[PDB]
Every structure is written in structure tokens, then in C-alpha cells.
Amino acid sequence: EVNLIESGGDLVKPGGSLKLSCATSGFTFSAYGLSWVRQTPERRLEWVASISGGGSVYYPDSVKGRFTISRDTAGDILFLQMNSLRSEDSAIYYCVRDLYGDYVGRYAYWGQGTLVIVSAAKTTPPSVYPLAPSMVTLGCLVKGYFPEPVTVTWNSGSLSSGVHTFPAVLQSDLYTLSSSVTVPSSTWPSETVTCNVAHPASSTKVDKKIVPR
Amino acid sequence: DIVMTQSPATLSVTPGDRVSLSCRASQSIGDYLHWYQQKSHESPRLLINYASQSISGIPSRFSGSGSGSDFTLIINSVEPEDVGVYYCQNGHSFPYTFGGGTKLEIRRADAAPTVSIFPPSSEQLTSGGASVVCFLNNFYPKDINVKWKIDGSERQNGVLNSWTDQDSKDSTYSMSSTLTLTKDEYERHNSYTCEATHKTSTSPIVKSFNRN
Amino acid sequence: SQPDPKPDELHKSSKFTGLMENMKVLYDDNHVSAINVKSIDQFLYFDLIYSIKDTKLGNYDNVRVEFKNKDLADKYKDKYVDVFGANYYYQCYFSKRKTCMYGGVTEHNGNQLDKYRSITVRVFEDGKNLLSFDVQTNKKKVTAQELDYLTRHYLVKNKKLYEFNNSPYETGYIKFIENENSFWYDMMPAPGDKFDQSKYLMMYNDNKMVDSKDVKIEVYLTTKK
């Protein structure tokens, strides 16, 4: 029932600005404490901002005077305006709602999160390469992109079992990742196996069919 | 600020164990202490509020205790799906602060990796690069050593590794290893081998191809 | 489970221009309390009359308890009960040392605990942890009314929730959570120049009860800007 959907994450140069949005549904928007909590690359969780039902706003010293939490009650949307961005602000940003009411220090519902990257490195699209050899393992290599994230599915998500998509590794300002899929021998090459890769930062969508050598 | 400390920061447990996770606050926070579970690729989930107060929908095996500065989360008969990171949180006073997390991993029967090797694609070679990729999938325990052998050199230059978090369903681990060379470097050699040393065998698992 | 407050539903104390004393008195020290008593009369089909006497201050010799329906009066007529409520005098009708209240009735037999149980009240101000404290009861099933009164009584005394002329708070509601279900009451008077105690208290006429072990209580207050 309760749903929170963050958007607006992007790559921004140090010193830049970004505005995040959190579109909510399934509850009376004005009746609950709403906050932003971020998760850093080191996997630390950090409280960023809160707004009470009555509109009182609260911030930690690290963002005070740079970040502004606000809302549009009629639109059921929570905002975070971020100014003078620093590398320490690079994180997944989540919108969160209280369990029962007007308390801003208890995070019962979370959105999926939106990614913010603070860096002067340039957006670069991936190259997507097929990895061809009772069960057979295939893969694809997604190389030389920036920033995160990429999404990878197999047969548009219809192949969900036997998939391992590995965390990206950074080298020389570019990320590379791979994904493996394991399927019965009887289904490949007989039938199509395709990896679908999306890199929204560069508006890249590639479907690479895996063809036998 | 109130510093929240979770120690041990990692635990390895046996299914059915009663597991106790510790959180300590640098100043008293009464019972204004909440607990979260975060599984791989998911947002955190609230498990317990106000140190010990249960929440509708959360399994009964989760419970909490403490007041002031010392708090404990208990998982009574831990299950494979409980693998993840557990965080505590000061909800008492500003700034709200989180513990660093305790990473929970679970034990299971040893399992040898399924190893697969892949030469550089024709498409990559056209671009002047050559990445050779090895997947080592669904193994346990997590400890493993992967070595590339190129015509009997075993210098591990140009290799980058990556690992999945422990699987929630089968409690296994997976790994990828990628050896990246220039096309010219790649074509100077014939035999490419991905060799995995793992507790499950006294002999390494070897997958190889000859560039021919 | 009751829908939470709609936007602008909560009463704003600044829009009430009468005297807040008429709210305060309902949550001051005096209230109706009787243990193991049985009704002795009835006026209308949805009420019961009890010979509960205020011997200390002499304000009443009988209490009329009003319920939302006939079933509740019928259920408790001729049962030994405990009575606990906030009472009123203006427009209290028995057809002169009389008082009226709504609900507040629990069966005595089988509802007693051998020791007091504590229920924590969590109070928030503008979203912040303000304070917490415990209310106590020796009833297995206790009226929301009794718990609301105990909660507000503390907040009047220690946080000046209501003062003679105004409140330091703009809005306030008290929320009860029991397992998967919740409900709440607005703590502020309706807007305008007069406060109708009878009409306000009628919210308790459902005789709503909660399990004293399971129930949780959170109070959300907002300050005037």
C-alpha cells in the first residue's frame, strides 16, 4: 500500500546543485514524519534531513545551509534541494516515512533510492561484449562506463534463475562489470539468449545476443 | 553527536543458532533505539523500534533488549534468508546517527566452484582490447584464490576481481575474474588458464583455452 | 483501523477563541471513578445511572453513563462494572447533584490484574522525541477513555497542554496502536467562541476498549509558529 519513489539522482561536478524528488502514495502525506537517509559507498547510513507533519525542518551540521527539505502536500511529493555538493555527498538517497505518525527519527517505509555521484569525471557509455564458450554458462561484459549504474537483464528478465551480475570495479575513472547466466544445453544455441544492458546516464540501451563461436 | 558502535562488525553463524548482535551508544538514549535489516540489493527494513517493541509483519524470531547505552538484537534460530547487514539507530536526539552495521553470514556444506572461461569477443578485439573472463560460481566457503596462467607466466598483472554477496537462498558465493590486455599482448600468447584453489579440492580446478 | 488525520482536519487551538479552561477541566484531577458497582436506574435506552457519589467535593450523588447504542446499555445493566470517565455538568440531563459521562465502563469480574501494568506514552513535539512516561492500569481490557484521560492529565500538569486561557500547542492528537489496528482522538477544541463539553466527550460513547498488554500510545503535538 505505502509506496515511496525517489528520482532525480545524477552525476554532478563538485560544487554543483541537484534536486531530488520522492513521489509518495498509499497514505495521507501530511500525517507522517518524512526524511531523507543516504547510504554511502562504505555502506554507512546517514540521516540527511527531516520534515515534520507541521513543516518543521531538521538537518545535521554536515548539510545545514546546503540542503533544503520541502514538500508539496497537494502533489504528495517530498523534495531535497542539494547545493554546494561535495564528494562526501555521493550516495544512494532514500526517502523514508515514520511507522505511525509525526515522529521524524524512525524509518518504517523506504523508497528504492536514487544515486547521486559527485565527481568531475566525464559520462562515458559502456561497450557491451558477448561472452560465448548438461548446463552451459554464457555472459556479457559491460566495459568502460561512467558513472554508475548500469542494469543488466537476460531475455528481458524472463531468465531470472542462474544469473550472477557482479559489482562493478573502477579503474582509470571507468567502471567494468560482468554478468553470467547458466541455462540448459538444450536451450542454447537452439534458442536466443540476449543480455539487455541499460546505462541511463549516456542514454545507452544495448541488446547483445550471445552467438556460438 | 551520539556515536553508535556495533561490535562485532562481522558474524558467521550456523542455521538454528540464537544470534546476538550488539549496539552501544556513546551517551544514554533511553529506549529510543531502532534496528534495521538490509539484504543484498534492497533498501533497509525496520525490524524493531524503541529497543524492544515489535512491529507488525516482522518474524517473531527477531527481538530486542536494552535501555540507556547497551542494546542487543536477538535472532532466535537464524535462517539462510537472514544474511545481510544489521544496523542500529539513535532516534533519541539530533543528529540522528546509525551504527556501522554488523554483517551476518551463514554456514552451509562446502561446495566447489563451477568454473567457466571466455576468450575475448570478436567485437572487443576489433576495438584493440582483449578481456578474458572467468566465472567461479556457487561455491562455499568464500575463501578462494584465482590465478591466471598465460603460457606459464603466473604474474597476475591486469586482473580485476569482483564478488557477489552471499546468496539468500543457497548460502553460496560467486566470483568473476577478468584479465585485460591489449590485443597485441593477447596475441603474443597461446594458452590461457583460469585456475581456482579452493578447500574442496587438493588439486586446483583448471579451465583453459588455446587461442587457436 | 481509522484513517489518519486528513490535511487540515486537526483542530487548531488558535482558531478557538473561547476559554481553554473548559477543555482543561475535563483532564484536571477530578473525574469519575468507581470499582465493582452496578447500575441502579436508567433514563433513556442508551444510558445507565449509577449511585457513584463525590463525597470529597460534594458535586454529585449519581452519575449517568451514556452509550452510543442500546446494546451497550443492555450489556452492562445489572453487571458489576468498573467506571472511569471525564464527566460534565452543563446540559447534563436525567429526565442538581448529578453528572454525566460517556462510556468508560468495563466488566469487573474476570478483568482484574493482580498487579498494575504499565503502558508507555510517547510524546512528540514538532516531530521530535519530547518525553515519555508510563500510565498504569490493573484492567486486562481498559477503555481508551481511561488511558486518554491519564495521558492528558499528566501533560496538563507537566507540559501545560491546556491552560486557563489557551494552549501552548497548535495541534495535538493521541494515537492508540493495538496489533494491526489503530485509532486516534483530536486533543484540541473545535473552532469558534464556545466549547461544547458534552459534544466533545461524546467521542467516548463507543466504550472503545484495548488490551492493556498490547496497546501502545503516541501523542503528536505541534507548536504555534
XYZ file of C-alpha atoms in Angstrom:
650
model
C 0.000 0.000 0.000
C 2.592 2.556 1.148
C 4.967 3.473 -1.634
C 7.829 5.985 -1.955
C 9.591 6.540 -5.296
C 12.720 8.653 -5.376
C 14.002 10.314 -8.509
C 16.494 12.940 -9.619
C 19.850 11.294 -8.880
C 22.600 12.241 -11.305
C 26.282 12.899 -11.751
C 27.233 16.435 -10.672
C 30.562 18.279 -10.542
C 31.893 19.203 -7.109
C 30.238 22.495 -6.093
C 27.142 21.797 -8.237
C 23.472 21.502 -7.277
C 20.800 18.812 -7.627
C 17.157 18.463 -6.606
C 15.746 15.079 -5.593
C 12.046 14.177 -5.582
C 10.135 11.480 -3.688
C 6.642 10.775 -5.022
C 4.506 9.031 -2.421
C 1.268 7.057 -2.368
C -0.914 4.834 -0.191
C -1.077 7.145 2.818
C -2.046 10.617 3.990
C 1.047 12.541 3.045
C 0.769 15.319 5.679
C 0.132 12.915 8.615
C 3.708 11.489 8.840
C 7.285 12.471 9.546
C 9.265 12.280 6.301
C 13.023 12.132 5.963
C 15.980 11.547 3.654
C 18.642 8.978 4.671
C 21.644 8.235 2.487
C 23.857 5.210 2.119
C 27.480 5.896 1.329
C 29.906 3.812 -0.741
C 31.284 2.419 2.546
C 27.746 1.168 3.355
C 27.212 3.691 6.158
C 23.737 5.057 6.688
C 23.476 8.784 7.337
C 20.477 10.875 8.279
C 20.330 13.868 5.913
C 17.084 15.810 6.585
C 13.656 15.603 8.179
C 10.330 17.387 7.906
C 7.566 17.020 10.498
C 3.852 16.953 9.745
C 3.597 20.594 10.786
C 6.510 21.538 8.493
C 9.377 21.845 10.965
C 12.687 21.053 9.268
C 15.824 19.469 10.728
C 19.352 18.815 9.391
C 22.699 17.519 10.576
C 25.570 20.058 10.680
C 27.234 18.416 7.636
C 24.425 19.561 5.268
C 22.953 22.566 7.132
C 22.783 25.560 4.833
C 23.472 23.427 1.716
C 20.436 21.140 1.723
C 16.750 22.082 1.908
C 13.946 19.605 2.555
C 10.486 20.693 1.407
C 7.174 19.304 0.340
C 4.203 19.795 -1.922
C 1.282 18.388 0.078
C -1.222 18.559 -2.799
C 1.224 16.648 -5.014
C 2.248 14.072 -2.336
C 5.883 14.885 -3.208
C 8.877 15.382 -0.911
C 11.932 17.246 -2.157
C 15.603 17.592 -1.288
C 17.456 20.528 -2.824
C 21.193 19.974 -2.557
C 23.639 22.813 -3.089
C 27.458 23.110 -2.968
C 27.787 19.365 -3.411
C 30.907 17.612 -2.041
C 32.378 14.166 -2.719
C 31.135 13.065 0.739
C 27.582 13.607 -0.593
C 27.997 10.768 -3.089
C 25.484 8.138 -2.006
C 22.195 6.372 -2.550
C 19.465 8.745 -1.280
C 16.340 7.235 0.220
C 13.041 8.859 1.139
C 11.576 7.408 4.369
C 8.328 7.645 6.342
C 7.546 7.104 10.014
C 5.795 3.978 11.298
C 2.729 5.693 12.890
C 2.789 9.451 12.751
C 4.550 12.719 13.400
C 7.967 11.439 14.556
C 10.994 12.015 12.312
C 13.504 9.533 13.847
C 12.053 6.130 12.884
C 12.231 4.807 9.318
C 9.435 2.295 8.659
C 8.988 2.680 4.871
C 11.812 3.305 2.391
C 11.902 4.057 -1.311
C 14.185 2.106 -3.693
C 16.680 5.006 -3.541
C 18.239 7.287 -6.159
C 22.001 7.531 -6.818
C 23.983 10.800 -6.540
C 27.588 10.913 -7.768
C 29.757 13.965 -7.125
C 32.759 13.951 -9.471
C 34.261 15.891 -12.377
C 34.839 12.660 -14.368
C 33.002 12.526 -17.695
C 29.993 10.411 -18.585
C 31.104 7.579 -20.813
C 28.926 4.878 -22.396
C 29.734 1.187 -21.954
C 30.838 -1.207 -24.624
C 28.891 -4.447 -24.312
C 30.626 -7.667 -25.340
C 29.151 -11.146 -25.551
C 30.871 -13.983 -23.672
C 30.337 -17.287 -25.521
C 32.126 -20.577 -24.630
C 24.018 -30.530 -19.386
C 24.289 -26.829 -18.407
C 26.066 -24.014 -20.274
C 27.219 -20.674 -18.884
C 27.190 -17.526 -21.021
C 27.817 -13.945 -20.113
C 28.287 -10.404 -21.071
C 30.950 -7.930 -20.216
C 29.919 -4.323 -19.765
C 33.136 -2.310 -20.028
C 34.345 1.263 -19.762
C 31.411 3.263 -18.445
C 30.856 6.142 -16.052
C 29.008 6.870 -13.791
C 27.067 4.049 -12.154
C 24.588 2.458 -12.546
C 24.003 0.009 -15.333
C 21.165 -2.509 -15.327
C 21.567 -5.962 -16.897
C 18.803 -8.454 -17.568
C 18.664 -11.643 -19.600
C 15.890 -12.211 -22.157
C 14.160 -9.059 -20.866
C 14.050 -10.520 -17.317
C 12.465 -13.802 -18.408
C 15.773 -15.507 -17.489
C 15.932 -14.793 -13.745
C 17.367 -18.042 -12.410
C 21.047 -18.864 -12.818
C 22.046 -15.208 -13.143
C 25.005 -13.636 -11.362
C 25.590 -9.968 -12.088
C 28.765 -8.841 -10.332
C 29.533 -5.460 -8.694
C 31.326 -3.048 -10.978
C 35.046 -2.446 -10.461
C 36.528 1.030 -11.090
C 39.764 1.575 -12.969
C 41.020 4.842 -14.520
C 37.707 6.592 -13.949
C 35.792 3.835 -15.752
C 33.674 1.001 -14.432
C 33.507 -2.504 -15.759
C 31.132 -5.300 -14.808
C 30.114 -8.756 -15.952
C 27.042 -10.926 -15.701
C 26.787 -14.672 -16.150
C 23.741 -16.769 -16.939
C 23.567 -20.558 -16.773
C 20.976 -22.379 -18.914
C 20.354 -25.932 -20.104
C 22.469 -27.050 -23.153
C 19.232 -27.917 -24.958
C 18.145 -24.236 -24.974
C 21.316 -22.635 -26.352
C 22.235 -22.146 -29.140
C 18.812 -23.575 -30.175
C 17.086 -20.541 -28.739
C 18.053 -16.937 -28.339
C 19.878 -15.726 -25.230
C 20.355 -11.983 -25.109
C 21.735 -9.696 -22.436
C 19.913 -6.340 -22.163
C 22.099 -3.561 -20.838
C 20.984 -0.033 -19.952
C 23.183 2.894 -18.980
C 20.755 5.763 -18.372
C 23.498 8.380 -17.843
C 24.518 8.036 -21.513
C 21.022 7.010 -22.765
C 22.513 3.687 -23.859
C 20.385 0.561 -24.318
C 22.023 -2.453 -25.919
C 20.670 -5.929 -26.559
C 23.577 -8.277 -27.283
C 22.662 -11.741 -28.492
C 25.113 -14.448 -27.463
C 26.136 -16.342 -30.607
C 28.282 -19.512 -30.639
C 31.919 -19.247 -31.678
C 26.990 13.675 18.457
C 25.902 10.284 19.767
C 28.203 7.656 18.297
C 26.652 4.244 17.784
C 29.021 1.266 17.867
C 28.235 -2.211 16.641
C 30.845 -4.766 17.582
C 31.434 -7.435 16.345
C 31.169 -5.841 12.918
C 31.006 -9.290 11.325
C 29.455 -12.641 12.372
C 29.433 -16.060 10.825
C 26.655 -18.265 12.164
C 25.158 -21.755 11.861
C 21.485 -22.138 10.858
C 19.365 -22.605 14.003
C 21.819 -20.618 16.210
C 20.487 -17.994 18.566
C 22.398 -14.957 17.326
C 23.103 -11.908 19.478
C 24.114 -8.593 17.898
C 25.454 -5.715 19.964
C 24.868 -1.943 19.751
C 26.352 0.588 22.152
C 25.628 4.349 22.322
C 28.263 6.848 23.481
C 25.630 8.656 25.650
C 22.332 7.432 27.058
C 19.437 7.409 24.578
C 16.851 5.726 26.844
C 14.980 3.257 24.670
C 14.969 5.471 21.535
C 16.968 2.908 19.562
C 15.729 1.246 16.385
C 17.042 -1.757 14.403
C 17.172 -2.310 10.630
C 17.988 -5.242 8.358
C 19.386 -4.704 4.893
C 19.595 -7.531 2.420
C 21.678 -7.506 -0.782
C 20.263 -5.095 -3.395
C 17.411 -3.956 -1.128
C 16.605 -0.954 0.948
C 16.865 -1.280 4.746
C 13.835 -2.609 6.621
C 12.779 -1.640 10.132
C 12.793 -4.702 12.434
C 12.426 -3.382 15.988
C 11.535 0.033 17.377
C 12.181 1.544 20.792
C 14.801 -1.123 21.654
C 12.334 -3.993 22.195
C 8.994 -3.136 20.636
C 7.964 -5.489 17.885
C 6.470 -4.453 14.579
C 3.548 -5.980 12.697
C 4.797 -8.175 9.815
C 8.292 -8.872 11.174
C 9.016 -12.527 12.019
C 8.831 -13.473 15.709
C 12.423 -14.766 15.739
C 13.560 -11.120 15.876
C 13.637 -9.452 19.300
C 15.475 -6.646 21.054
C 16.513 -5.534 24.536
C 18.282 -2.711 26.371
C 17.951 0.831 27.632
C 20.416 3.673 28.008
C 23.706 2.792 26.343
C 23.780 -1.004 25.731
C 21.400 -2.784 23.315
C 21.025 -6.254 21.862
C 19.191 -7.678 18.832
C 18.421 -11.393 19.009
C 17.653 -13.652 16.065
C 16.268 -16.822 17.583
C 17.086 -19.697 15.161
C 18.740 -17.847 12.342
C 17.750 -18.850 8.786
C 19.636 -18.666 5.428
C 17.490 -15.719 4.363
C 18.712 -13.635 7.344
C 22.074 -12.941 5.677
C 22.649 -9.223 5.307
C 23.715 -6.204 7.346
C 22.018 -5.211 10.610
C 22.085 -1.551 11.697
C 21.084 0.167 14.892
C 19.955 3.801 15.020
C 19.755 6.598 17.566
C 16.244 8.080 17.238
C 16.577 9.960 20.522
C 18.080 13.332 19.627
C 19.789 15.170 16.797
C 21.767 14.431 14.816
C 20.163 11.016 14.313
C 23.027 8.551 13.950
C 23.441 4.962 12.798
C 25.756 2.172 13.903
C 28.292 0.933 11.312
C 26.443 -2.304 10.860
C 27.097 -5.916 11.611
C 27.440 -8.199 8.584
C 25.879 -11.613 9.060
C 26.961 -14.636 7.007
C 25.696 -18.184 7.339
C 27.337 -21.601 7.279
C 26.493 -24.445 4.937
C 28.099 -27.558 3.377
C 31.285 -26.990 1.367
C 30.703 -26.600 -2.374
C 33.263 -26.464 -5.173
C 33.016 -23.595 -7.684
C 31.609 -24.045 -11.174
C 34.334 -22.504 -13.319
C 33.817 -21.103 -16.819
C 36.364 -19.322 -19.066
C 35.702 -17.000 -22.011
C 38.077 -15.653 -24.623
C 37.858 -12.057 -25.855
C 34.953 -11.435 -28.171
C 35.496 -10.642 -31.846
C 33.810 -7.288 -31.172
C 36.284 -6.369 -28.437
C 39.297 -7.479 -30.493
C 38.198 -5.154 -33.332
C 38.492 -2.304 -30.796
C 42.108 -3.234 -29.924
C 41.391 -4.659 -26.454
C 41.267 -8.190 -25.075
C 39.478 -9.153 -21.862
C 39.487 -12.792 -20.789
C 36.786 -13.578 -18.220
C 36.471 -16.365 -15.670
C 33.344 -17.026 -13.575
C 33.632 -19.096 -10.400
C 30.071 -19.641 -9.349
C 28.142 -21.028 -6.378
C 30.954 -22.016 -4.019
C 31.395 -22.334 -0.234
C 33.341 -21.275 1.805
C 34.054 -17.810 0.444
C 37.849 -18.143 0.680
C 39.339 -18.745 -2.789
C 42.463 -17.950 -4.812
C 42.225 -17.435 -8.556
C 45.323 -17.383 -10.708
C 45.638 -16.689 -14.382
C 48.318 -18.568 -16.301
C 49.440 -17.285 -19.702
C 51.864 -19.803 -21.311
C 53.278 -20.482 -17.820
C 53.713 -16.946 -16.627
C 51.739 -16.564 -13.473
C 52.182 -12.858 -12.804
C 48.689 -11.557 -12.016
C 49.029 -8.268 -13.935
C 45.914 -6.642 -15.460
C 43.487 -8.727 -13.369
C 40.425 -7.336 -11.643
C 38.156 -9.385 -9.408
C 34.566 -8.981 -8.182
C 32.407 -10.954 -5.708
C 28.706 -11.343 -5.008
C 27.288 -11.131 -1.533
C 26.320 -14.438 -0.001
C 23.182 -15.824 -1.626
C 19.961 -15.612 0.438
C 18.603 -18.913 -0.900
C 21.618 -21.257 -1.187
C 24.201 -19.526 1.024
C 26.865 -19.708 -1.704
C 29.315 -17.187 -3.052
C 30.306 -16.290 -6.620
C 33.255 -14.514 -8.200
C 34.376 -13.048 -11.515
C 37.966 -12.534 -12.572
C 38.857 -10.522 -15.674
C 42.274 -10.364 -17.249
C 42.595 -7.361 -19.517
C 45.375 -6.974 -22.074
C 45.946 -5.077 -25.297
C 45.055 -7.056 -28.412
C 48.738 -7.120 -29.296
C 49.685 -8.537 -25.855
C 46.850 -11.077 -26.091
C 48.017 -12.352 -29.483
C 51.603 -12.927 -28.274
C 50.415 -15.970 -26.282
C 48.541 -19.217 -26.858
C 47.473 -20.909 -23.628
C 45.071 -19.107 -21.277
C 44.112 -20.727 -17.972
C 41.909 -19.708 -15.063
C 42.943 -21.768 -12.016
C 40.915 -21.879 -8.800
C 42.335 -23.069 -5.496
C 39.593 -23.918 -3.021
C 39.320 -26.034 0.149
C 37.032 -28.525 -1.640
C 39.970 -29.998 -3.632
C 43.661 -30.622 -3.006
C 44.010 -30.052 -6.764
C 43.010 -26.744 -8.348
C 40.088 -26.526 -10.791
C 41.548 -25.523 -14.163
C 39.713 -24.121 -17.185
C 41.668 -23.155 -20.239
C 41.613 -22.473 -23.925
C 44.256 -22.210 -26.597
C 43.865 -19.040 -28.646
C 43.836 -21.329 -31.713
C -8.223 0.831 11.506
C -9.107 4.550 11.475
C -7.917 6.732 8.581
C -5.238 9.128 9.825
C -5.966 12.838 10.039
C -6.769 14.369 6.658
C -4.925 17.562 5.712
C -6.272 20.415 7.850
C -8.591 18.057 9.792
C -6.868 18.591 13.143
C -8.344 21.452 15.163
C -6.102 24.462 15.581
C -6.107 25.902 19.104
C -5.573 29.419 17.722
C -8.968 29.142 15.950
C -10.702 28.501 19.278
C -11.422 31.897 20.875
C -13.331 30.714 23.954
C -11.592 29.816 27.212
C -9.419 26.730 27.241
C -10.342 26.176 30.906
C -13.483 24.394 29.673
C -11.289 21.781 27.997
C -8.685 21.706 30.784
C -11.197 20.847 33.494
C -12.037 17.559 31.740
C -8.396 16.410 32.238
C -7.710 18.010 35.636
C -7.620 15.925 38.847
C -11.350 15.347 39.207
C -13.018 12.573 37.241
C -15.497 9.771 37.786
C -14.090 6.545 39.163
C -15.886 3.601 40.757
C -14.884 -0.039 41.170
C -17.284 -3.028 41.316
C -20.571 -1.141 41.098
C -23.893 -1.960 39.421
C -26.441 0.289 37.732
C -29.439 1.360 39.771
C -31.603 3.215 37.232
C -31.884 4.278 33.619
C -33.312 7.377 31.938
C -33.173 6.594 28.208
C -32.460 3.272 26.433
C -28.795 4.027 25.750
C -27.824 5.061 29.299
C -27.281 3.654 32.747
C -27.385 5.502 36.077
C -25.021 4.619 38.941
C -25.080 5.790 42.587
C -21.486 6.963 42.446
C -21.029 9.783 44.963
C -18.397 12.523 45.139
C -18.030 12.634 48.920
C -14.861 14.745 48.832
C -16.173 17.804 46.911
C -19.908 17.060 47.032
C -20.513 17.728 43.313
C -22.747 14.731 42.563
C -24.572 11.793 44.152
C -25.311 9.918 40.927
C -23.624 9.516 37.525
C -25.413 8.986 34.213
C -23.325 6.950 31.724
C -24.338 7.446 28.081
C -23.518 4.923 25.325
C -23.826 5.038 21.541
C -26.483 2.368 21.399
C -28.961 0.200 23.255
C -26.771 -2.929 23.067
C -24.099 -1.374 25.321
C -26.627 -0.253 27.982
C -28.253 -3.699 27.879
C -24.904 -5.463 28.124
C -23.864 -3.635 31.280
C -27.238 -3.112 33.035
C -27.117 -5.440 36.113
C -23.411 -6.345 35.580
C -20.818 -5.446 38.189
C -18.559 -2.958 36.428
C -15.740 -0.504 36.827
C -16.486 3.046 35.715
C -13.847 5.610 34.688
C -14.530 8.824 32.823
C -14.316 12.516 32.243
C -17.655 13.989 33.371
C -19.685 17.113 32.630
C -22.473 19.156 34.195
C -23.721 21.679 31.597
C -26.672 20.190 29.694
C -26.424 17.003 31.776
C -29.980 15.626 31.834
C -31.502 12.803 33.934
C -35.122 13.471 32.773
C -28.977 19.109 40.992
C -26.071 16.998 42.313
C -25.862 14.990 39.085
C -23.226 14.436 36.460
C -22.994 12.792 33.058
C -20.268 10.977 31.113
C -19.922 8.701 28.079
C -18.694 5.128 28.002
C -15.938 4.291 30.446
C -17.474 1.008 31.574
C -15.698 -2.344 31.809
C -16.986 -5.603 33.331
C -15.390 -6.126 36.711
C -15.419 -9.935 37.002
C -12.533 -11.559 35.125
C -10.990 -8.239 34.046
C -8.745 -7.665 37.062
C -4.970 -7.994 37.053
C -3.197 -8.965 40.300
C -0.560 -6.237 39.682
C -0.545 -2.940 37.782
C 0.560 -2.951 34.175
C 2.441 -0.019 32.669
C 1.766 1.451 29.189
C 4.371 3.810 27.811
C 3.186 7.107 26.356
C 5.492 8.512 23.697
C 5.128 12.259 23.246
C 6.414 14.124 20.184
C 6.677 17.816 19.553
C 7.134 19.047 16.009
C 8.319 15.530 15.089
C 10.907 15.314 17.916
C 11.081 12.958 20.889
C 9.745 15.261 23.642
C 9.275 12.852 26.519
C 7.902 9.503 27.552
C 6.244 8.311 30.738
C 4.111 5.435 31.895
C 0.419 5.227 32.707
C -0.794 2.320 34.809
C -3.862 0.154 34.926
C -4.966 -3.034 36.702
C -7.531 -3.879 33.988
C -6.904 -6.558 31.302
C -9.164 -4.612 28.926
C -9.180 -0.860 29.608
C -11.152 1.910 27.919
C -9.282 4.230 25.529
C -11.027 6.944 27.525
C -9.278 5.998 30.757
C -5.878 5.881 29.013
C -6.523 9.193 27.202
C -7.516 10.854 30.483
C -4.403 9.523 32.288
C -2.195 10.682 29.420
C -3.656 14.182 29.203
C -3.807 14.578 32.948
C -0.037 14.194 33.044
C 0.513 16.561 30.102
C -1.722 19.240 31.637
C 0.241 19.103 34.905
C 3.718 18.875 33.419
C 3.560 20.380 29.930
C 0.621 22.854 30.347
C -1.167 21.065 27.492
C -4.204 23.178 28.445
C -4.010 26.394 30.450
C -6.876 28.528 31.653
C -6.956 30.846 28.614
C -5.095 28.944 25.830
C -2.718 26.105 24.914
C 0.959 26.417 24.055
C 0.269 23.872 21.273
C -1.448 24.487 17.959
C -2.498 20.887 17.226
C -2.450 17.630 19.075
C -3.712 14.118 18.613
C -3.319 10.936 20.577
C -2.981 7.665 18.659
C -3.607 4.193 20.052
C -1.981 1.219 18.322
C -3.058 -2.337 19.080
C -1.503 -5.041 16.882
C -2.587 -4.266 13.269
C -5.197 -1.642 14.207
C -5.116 1.996 15.263
C -7.355 4.932 16.058
C -6.920 8.454 17.349
C -8.603 11.465 19.023
C -8.110 15.155 18.356
C -6.954 16.841 21.563
C -8.000 20.384 20.641
C -11.375 22.065 20.718
C -13.415 22.805 17.573
C -13.004 26.305 16.141
C -15.140 29.192 17.371
C -16.109 31.024 20.534
C -17.605 28.222 22.672
C -16.587 24.723 23.668
C -19.321 22.115 23.959
C -18.092 19.617 26.560
C -20.961 17.217 26.061
C -20.412 17.113 22.291
C -16.645 16.679 22.696
C -16.897 13.854 25.229
C -19.474 12.005 23.110
C -16.491 10.598 21.195
C -16.049 8.202 24.126
C -19.620 6.812 23.834
C -18.484 3.792 21.807
C -16.960 2.402 25.034
C -13.871 1.530 22.992
C -11.534 -0.842 24.886
C -7.988 -2.025 24.293
C -5.806 -4.816 25.689
C -3.577 -3.254 28.350
C -0.621 -5.532 27.430
C -0.727 -4.894 23.661
C -1.754 -1.232 23.370
C 0.803 1.473 22.544
C 0.245 5.214 22.797
C 1.815 8.010 20.807
C 0.945 11.708 21.186
C 1.781 14.180 18.415
C 1.890 17.859 19.291
C 2.760 20.845 17.096
C 3.788 24.259 18.361
C 2.382 27.546 17.275
C 4.561 29.304 14.784
